[PDB]
């Protein structure tokens, strides 16, 4: 028996809209299962899409206001990383927050997940990581990720500093200022903050993120279904996987 922290970090591109519909009651269902395995479980929520700058995002006034004018559908303007829910014991609070989320742009390119992973690992007080507990960071996405100097296309040439940049609205305020973290920078911060990174990604992304995880200590990869239908089982499996570190 050991306390567990879970931070749900979800891709909110339009392709994750059906995933959102299936997670509507994941919070209460997950804390019911974790109740079997531990007595102290706390879950939180955050979301991400991409750096809201050219060329990663169309930049006419209308396309900024609605990056889904092509569906045609109403969706939120692209955003970098929103930290919605600090990890808490209230599973119902997780439910209503999920039911109130809305998908942003309909991206089919790599995304800015690494920015959010960095913020989730580093912002200890904001995300709410407990000192003596397992830190599980679940990364839910159906797309590849941008890293490092990919932001050079946007004129973003200041490297990531690995500091916490949440602007009171719990939004990443350096999304347009700093570069995407590098894998070496993520490794450095995930290890220092004792964060176990779970890549719950769809089939086209599994092998790619497998290779990323093989460089990142404590990282694992789970094959996520297109509507996130198996995310509950993936989290329990990953938790029980990390709970037995053979490590030869």
């Amino acid at each position: 028996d050991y306390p567990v922290d879970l931070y749900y970090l979800m891709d909110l591109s339009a392709s994750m809209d059906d995933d959102l519909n299936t997670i509507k009651e994941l919070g209460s269902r997950l804390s019911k299962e974790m109740s079997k395995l531990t007595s102290n479980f706390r879950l939180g929520f955050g979301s991400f899409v991409e750096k809201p700058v050219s060329p990663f995002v169309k930049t006419t006034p209308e396309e900024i206001a609605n990056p889904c004018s092509s569906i045609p559908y109403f969706c939120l303007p692209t955003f970098g990383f929103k930290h919605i829910l600090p990890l808490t014991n209230d599973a119902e609070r997780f439910n209503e927050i999920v039911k109130n989320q809305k998908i942003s742009a309909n991206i089919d390119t790599p995304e800015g997940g690494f920015d959010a992973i960095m913020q989730a690992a580093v912002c200890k007080e904001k995300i709410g990581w407990r000192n003596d507990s397992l830190h599980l960071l679940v990364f839910v996405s159906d797309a590849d990720s941008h890293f490092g100097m990919d932001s050079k296309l946007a004129g973003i040439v200041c490297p990531n500093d690995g500091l916490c940049h949440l602007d009171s609205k719990n939004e990443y305020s350096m999304s347009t200022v700093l570069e995407y973290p590098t894998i070496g920078q993520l490794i450095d911060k995930l290890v220092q903050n004792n964060v176990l990174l779970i890549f719950a990604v769809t089939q086209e992304q599994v092998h790619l993120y497998e290779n990323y995880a093989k460089l990142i200590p404590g990282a694992t990869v789970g094959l996520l279904q297109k509507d996130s239908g198996n995310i509950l089982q993936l989290i329990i499996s990953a938790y029980e996987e990390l709970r037995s570190e053979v490590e030869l």
């Binding site: 050219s54 060329p55 169309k58 930049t59 006419t60 390119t109 790599p110 590849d144 890293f147 490092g148 100097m149 990919d150 050079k152 296309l153 946007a154 004129g155 040439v157 200041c158 490297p159 200022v177 590098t182 894998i183 070496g184 920078q185 490794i187 092998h207 790619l208 290779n211 990323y212 460089l215």
Partner: protein
Amino acid sequence: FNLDVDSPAEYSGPEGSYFGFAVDFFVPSRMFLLVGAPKANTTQPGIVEGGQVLKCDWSSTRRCQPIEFDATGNRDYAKDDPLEFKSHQWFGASVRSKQDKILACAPLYHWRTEMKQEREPVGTCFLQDGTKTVEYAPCRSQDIDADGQGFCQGGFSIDFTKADRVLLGGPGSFYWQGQLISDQVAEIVSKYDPNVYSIKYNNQLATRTAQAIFDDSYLGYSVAVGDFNGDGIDDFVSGVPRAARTLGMVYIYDGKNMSSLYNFTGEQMAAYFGFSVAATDINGDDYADVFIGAPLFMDRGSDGKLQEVGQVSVSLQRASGDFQTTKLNGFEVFARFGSAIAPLGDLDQDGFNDIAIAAPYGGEDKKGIVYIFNGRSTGLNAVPSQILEGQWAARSGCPPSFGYSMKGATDIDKNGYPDLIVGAFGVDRAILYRARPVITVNAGLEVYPSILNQDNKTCSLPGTALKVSCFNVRFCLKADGKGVLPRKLNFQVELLLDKLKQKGAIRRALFLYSRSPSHSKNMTISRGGLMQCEELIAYLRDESEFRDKLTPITIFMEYRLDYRTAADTTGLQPILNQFTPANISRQAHIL
């Protein structure tokens, strides 16, 4: 090793303008430094932070002047319908110069397209050939939107060939497959029309759109030129850093028909293999060699754990078409060794080209480091012969980024050696390091007689009666150089008798007039002339004073240049070559 780091020329621009993001030379006459300031405010009407390229002169104290490529604002497609968007276009993010030609580009330049009201970053370049200044935007076409060239960002990287072709990289073409575009400079200027926004060039070489699996590759992220099929035509080298599922690749295309010639592939995920590339013959065989930067490469530490140090691969073009590849790892964690790779030419004029590799975030206070590597017959010397340190701390958002851009292979002061510009955009600075001239010394050392009979007491010690067994120590000194250098070279020469005696053994040989094993002598010599020599008498201790009669008595001569008084009219002090030991030894034997 011969770069003068004591008094380099420091050029600076407006704060926040990223002065130094791209640097180059200009040799049309006098010579100049070309510095890019892509975030610089200009006088263009309504254009916020259009960016500029500045021409800095070497002769005068700094005094940099912006080069007016375009003074106009945003052209209108129609009334209240702007055709283009030049604000924050990053003009000067890449500057490339060849003789009287200057090519600068704005990779974040957006335009409307002529079909609908969009805002697509096609990128644009301005070319300045002598008097006429033309615009060059090969991606500003009717093939619009991300599927086409709408997000191509042409001019993200540029280069010139040796036959007057431009090589332009557009990493965003075809859903970020990227693209290489090559146009003849003559067709670019002749077909330029300020009322035509999509100009078709007949001799254009361009890569084509491929299958969707090659999306998200960023071909054209960096570029370089060099011949790789032995036909005299410079071929196209380009980093493709997101190719092979973020393993990264480097494509080589023939510079005549854009056919694929060779491929390199990174060996570690997300190391950004291909961020920077360079092509120069490093081992003196006239076959250009490939340098591929991977600034995020993680190697193994002493503890076995990965550490991000960055890596440069050195690929020697074999005559058989193959490549002999080795790898050069960075020295500091997170320094991003390999972010910039600048061929320097032959920095020391020893017959082999040299190269600089920057770690823009290394050194104290993350002020940046540049490493100097010399070539030789067997390839690149893995150990750097000089370390260039940044001096300017960061009080800005960005770190100083000393080394993030640099240019070599141009002798800006006509001293016979190529020099090096190093940009530091985080502190709005560019620094010119001038190569010091290299002294080749031919030293001589004669010991006669070379076999010493202790019973042969010729000389007598000054002030006493007992004679000693003596011999003459004659040392000669001769120097010359290939570049522009003064005549009077001041040498400080040291001689030590019986240097290679055993640990704690008795000094067996001493100088006659001094009764000391060491002798110092200052020698002013003029280069090119005959050898200047000096004779001196040394003697052995009495045979009863020591037992080691079998060890050869080695006469050791050490010489160093004074450096203090040999400065040139430009204050450029010479330096001795590193490949040569600045010492000589000669041994004598006892009977």
